[PDB]
């Protein structure tokens, strides 16, 4: 009786999806918060 191995797609997605989402948040907030003119 063999069993399924843990999906390498899942294994690398666990590190990829949070990492890319965090980098996107970094870039988005950095490029949008500092946008208005100043005196």
């Amino acid at each position, epitope marked *: 009786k063999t069993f399924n191995s843990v999906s390498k797609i899942d294994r690398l997605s666990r590190i990829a999806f949070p990492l890319l989402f965090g980098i996107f948040n970094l870039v988005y907030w950095a490029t949008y918060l500092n946008r208005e003119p*100043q*005196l």
Partner: nanobody
Amino acid sequence: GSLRVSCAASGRTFTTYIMAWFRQAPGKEREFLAAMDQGRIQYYGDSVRGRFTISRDYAKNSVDLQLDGLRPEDTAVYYCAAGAGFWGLRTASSYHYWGQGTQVTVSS
């Protein structure tokens, strides 16, 4: 001497923006000549009040400046600008879009 410097915008409709003309002489800082608002209201600098006349063609998305009574100290690079007028209508920092500039010289 009389002149008319025109400015045409592309890639964005500036109907709801203020369009302005600035001037930069050699060594001197950039200064505000004129501005015109969506409400057809015209603002002028003290140095060029009554001489320079600003107008806008909203259909063509352009701003024109008629120059009359030119003098030797009017020699400078003249810049077209468009902006929302935040903290401004007179400060260059309030205008996000800028033209390349056009040289103008007066010879006696």
